[PDB]
Paper text:
As the core subunits of the CCAN, CENP-H, CENP-I and CENP-K (also known as Mcm16/Ctf3/Mcm22 in Saccharomyces cerevisiae and Fta3/Mis6/Sim4 in Schizosaccharomyces pombe) assemble into a ternary complex and are essential for the integrity of the kinetochore. At the inner layer, a number of centromere proteins form a network termed CCAN (the constitutive centromere-associated network) that binds to the centromere throughout the cell cycle. We here determined the crystal structures of CENP-I N-terminus alone from Chaetomium thermophilum and its complex with CENP-H/K from Thielavia terrestris, and verified the identified interactions. CENP-I integrates into the CENP-H/K complex by binding to the C-terminus of CENP-H, leading to formation of the ternary complex in which CENP-H is sandwiched between CENP-K and CENP-I. Our sequence comparisons and mutational analyses showed that this architecture of the CENP–H/I/K complex is conserved in human.
We also determined the crystal structure of the hybrid complex between ctCENP-INT and thCENP-H/K at 2.2Å with the Molecular Replacement method using the ctCENP-INT structure as start model. In one asymmetric unit of the complex crystal, one thCENP-H/K heterodimer interacts with one ctCENP-INT homodimer. The homodimer of ctCENP-INT might be a crystal packing artifact, since the complex shows a 1:1:1 stoichiometry in solution. Although the full-length thCENP-H/K proteins were used in crystallization, only the C-terminal portions of thCENP-H (184–228aa, thCENP-HCT) and thCENP-K (161–328aa, thCENP-KCT) are found in the structure. Overall, the ternary complex adopts a sandwich-like structure. ctCENP-INT and thCENP-KCT on each side pack against thCENP-HCT in the middle. thCENP-HCT contains two α-helixes HH1 and HH2 to interact with both thCENP-KCT and ctCENP-INT. In the structure of thCENP-KCT, three helixes KH1, KH2 and KH3 wrap around the HH1 helix of thCENP-HCT. On the other side of the complex, helixes α5 and α7 of ctCENP-INT contact with HH2 helix of thCENP-HCT. The sidechain of thCENP-H I205 inserts into a hydrophobic cavity surrounded by L177, F180, I270 and F300 of thCENP-K. On the other side, I211 and L219 of thCENP-H contact with the hydrophobic patch formed by W179, F180 and H184 of thCENP-K. The salt-bridge is formed between R220 in thCENP-H and E86 of ctCENP-INT. L224 in thCENP-H interacts with the hydrophobic concavity formed by L89, V126 and V130 in ctCENP-INT.
Numbering used by the authors:
A (entry chain B), D (entry chain A): 8 to 197, 206 to 229
B (entry chain D): 184 to 227
C (entry chain C): 161 to 191, 258 to 328
The structure:
């Protein structure tokens, strides 16, 4: 039932809203409802990420609705993760900063479901160089705090984060990340990030429990 | 004796750091091209 | 030793970067393309060659740059290079290679 | 503080119980309480798996109590999985079948936490060859149901499952595994596996929720 809905959203995604022979809001709500009930397979996730990440004619409300109901069934692939990472920052190919904050929030909430959590370590510099962008900084810091390992705490990133902390007048999300840095190198001069939506976490857990059934 | 090893190994660290930030800074979709993706991704 | 693999990886990567600069970046810098690619690669080569030449002396790693060089602007906006605070005609790389436990 | 508890339990596990100078059970109860509260990191899991699978002088009640409290924090490594796999079946060094049944129950309950779930596919024969052992058959069937892929459904395995199903009379755990074999192939003669302990599952989930915080 779900791949038929994505096939429709994909087609409507290709043509402007007023040229659509049907309003899409009814079909976006069917997809939203199916995702809330069943989750999104690995393959459906990948198609949804393309729809959320490439420039198309979908409206912001519909994209945010999809993002907020993107509960994975089973795992989360590198293909999906990297697409959201490549969406981040400024550029004519990239989505709005508001959706970017939602994608970053999402990655924190599904971090435990990545097939290859190390892939975020391989793009650590892409995430880190974006800390200047205030509109996504809180979500960036939380994700970076989960991704940071000792190999990433390099002197130039220590200095960059200290300068950014001083120039913003002390962002508490920046000092939370610096705390993680200090755990690897206590030599450094001195919010413990909580889950951003407990009810979403609880709903994901319910969906995920079906993986034990057979 | 071994200062040569990490000198070559560091020389890769500088190229990978600069190559990744250059491709990610260009604005190009580096995710959906294998060549560009290898340029950006650090090693596991 | 494992040393020429860190040399094989770096010669391979250096060719991939030069391909990217020629095929994609030089065109973007125009908005001729060939001229932009040659000067961005010269500048990155000069930048990297020096960073190591200092080793410890962080102060010596600045290259002289033409007044309005778009290459430097792009490298500074991409966070791969930094101007000198006192004057913006010299320019250093960010020192990705330096590591505390290297 | 969990390292020191395991150290002491390892030491006492090599001493026959009548020759000990102090009971080990109060320390096992401290271990069990710590596991319930914080779970077991990957490195602690390996040490506990060694305690549970190598022949020692710990009593069956103490081994079961640790198994029932073996909540992983984060992931389950291949080496941990393979320690348990290598303990299954009959052999001078292997644990009791009753403990083996709890090991297989555990693998089912932590299946979603394996770093590399494919590891169980590489030892498929080991699992499938144990099906005639009634004392672990219900737990084997559930794990087999989760792990079997098309490559594993060879003609000789289909026949052995039908031979075993005939020889036991009705066995709904075999019927359930044959149902799984019948998605991959259409052609042969025609109990959904629920999670064995929802309370354990719920408690594991709450411990796992800490991975989203930094």
């Amino acid at each position: 039932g779900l791949p038929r809905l994505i096939d429709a959203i994909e087609e409507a995604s290709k043509i402007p809203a007023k040229r659509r022979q049907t309003p899409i809001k009814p079909t976006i709500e069917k997809l939203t409802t199916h995702l809330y009930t069943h989750g999104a397979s690995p393959d459906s996730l990948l198609r949804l990420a393309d729809l959320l990440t490439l420039r198309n004619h979908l409206d912001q409300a519909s994209l945010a609705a999809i993002t907020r109901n993107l509960y994975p069934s089973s795992t989360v692939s590198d293909e999906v993760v990297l697409r959201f990472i490549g969406a981040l920052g400024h550029g004519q190919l990239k989505p709005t900063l508001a959706l970017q904050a939602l994608f970053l929030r999402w990655l924190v909430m599904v971090y435990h479901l990545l097939e290859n959590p190390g892939v975020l370590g391989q793009v650590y510099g892409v995430l880190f160089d974006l800390l200047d962008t205030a509109a996504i900084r809180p979500q960036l810091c939380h994700l970076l705090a989960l991704v940071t390992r000792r190999k990433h705490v390099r002197p130039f990133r220590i200095q960059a984060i200290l300068t950014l902390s001083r120039q913003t007048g002390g962002d508490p999300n920046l000092t939370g990340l610096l705390r993680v840095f200090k755990n690897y190198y206590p030599e450094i001069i001195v919010s413990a990030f909580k889950h951003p939506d407990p009810q979403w976490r609880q709903h994901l857990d319910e969906i995920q429990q079906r993986r034990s059934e057979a | 004796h071994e200062a040569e090893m990490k000198s070559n190994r560091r020389r890769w660290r500088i190229m990978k750091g600069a190559a990744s930030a250059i491709v990610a800074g260009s604005g190009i979709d580096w995710v959906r091209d294998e060549r560009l993706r290898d340029l950006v991704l650090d090693l596991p | 030793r494992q040393k020429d693999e860190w040399a094989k990886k770096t010669s391979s990567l250096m060719k991939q970067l030069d391909w990217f600069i020629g095929e994609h970046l030089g065109a973007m810098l125009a908005a001729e393309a060939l001229a932009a690619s040659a000067e961005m690669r010269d500048l990155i080569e000069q930048l990297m060659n020096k960073l190591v030449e200092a080793g410890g002396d962080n102060s010596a790693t600045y290259v002289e740059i033409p007044r309005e060089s778009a290459a430097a602007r792009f490298l500074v906006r991409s966070k791969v290079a930094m101007f000198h605070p006192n004057d913006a005609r010299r320019l250093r790389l960010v020192d990705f290679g330096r590591d505390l436990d290297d």
